[PDB]
Structure 1
Amino acid sequence: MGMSVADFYGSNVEVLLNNDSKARGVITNFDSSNSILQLRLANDSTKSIVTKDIKDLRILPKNEIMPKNGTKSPSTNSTKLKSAETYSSKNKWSMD
């Protein structure tokens, strides 16, 4: 039907600017009066860009954006920091 940008706040998308340069990041804000868009990129960096310099916009795929794979990946299986005294391999239950 039709939605406003407030629904797409926090969306990760890529944007090509009038100078044929590309930049992608997760949106944080947009001001109607000045049309000014803040993007918070996953490298812990903030960047404010005024939308008027946008030549074109596109939404990127969710996860696996840089790396290319052909698996469903139902679980993230991540263990960054926070370690316990238990180890798990493949799956806790097999042939169950």
Structure 2
Amino acid sequence: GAMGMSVADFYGSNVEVLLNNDSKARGVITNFDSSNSILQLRLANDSTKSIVTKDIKDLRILPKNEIMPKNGTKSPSTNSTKLKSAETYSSKNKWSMDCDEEFDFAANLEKFDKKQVFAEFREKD
């Protein structure tokens, strides 16, 4: 059905847009200017880019979450390689204090990061 919406709802929402050259990009909106129509998109990969809306060829909004259970006939809400059956629900309230999203939970004491580390620091021992 149709519902009333506000400009603040679009700000900070995650949408994807194709530019005039048929390239696609997605992220969460971080700024919008009515004087020159300029939009900054910040995506959950810690990357942000400022793009003027006039080069928007096409716009879409990605599903943040699914309200109903997944039967299988419908397509996946997001693009991923493999899903773990042990993991399914995240963030009991809304989000986590550490980072923007929680991933690689593992068993804490065992398998901290697939037995591999990029930076060295050793918090203890």
Q: TM-score range by the shorter chain?
A: 0.5 to 0.7
Higher relative contact order (CA 8 A, sep 6+): 1
How far does residue 73 in structure 1 lie from its aligned partner after superposition? 16
Relative distance call for 1:49 and 1:80 in structure 2 (3 A) is same
Match of 2:68 among 29, 43, 66: 66
- What runs of 5+ residues in structure 2 fail to find an aligned partner? 98-124
Aligned to 1:43: 45
Relative distance call for 1:38 and 1:81 in structure 2 (3 A) is same
Structure 2 Cα separation of the partners of residues 92 and 31 of structure 1: 29
CA contact (8 A) 2:17 2:59 kept: yes
How far does residue 7 in structure 1 lie from its aligned partner after superposition? 2.2
* Runs of at least 4 residues off by over 6 Å: 64-69, 71-96
CA contact (8 A) 2:66 2:77 kept: no
Structure having the larger proportion of residues in strand: 1
Root-mean-square deviation (Å): 10.4
Relative distance call for 1:92 and 1:71 in structure 2 (3 A) is farther
Relative distance call for 1:53 and 1:61 in structure 2 (3 A) is same
Q: TM-score, normalised by structure 2?
A: 0.49
Question: Is the aligned partner of 1:16 residue 2:22?
Answer: no
Q: TM-score, normalised by structure 1?
A: 0.62
CA contact (8 A) 2:37 2:53 kept: yes
Structure 2 Cα separation of the partners of residues 41 and 93 of structure 1: 16
CA contact (8 A) 1:25 1:42 kept: yes
- What runs of 5+ residues in structure 1 fail to find an aligned partner? none
How many correspondences in the alignment?
96
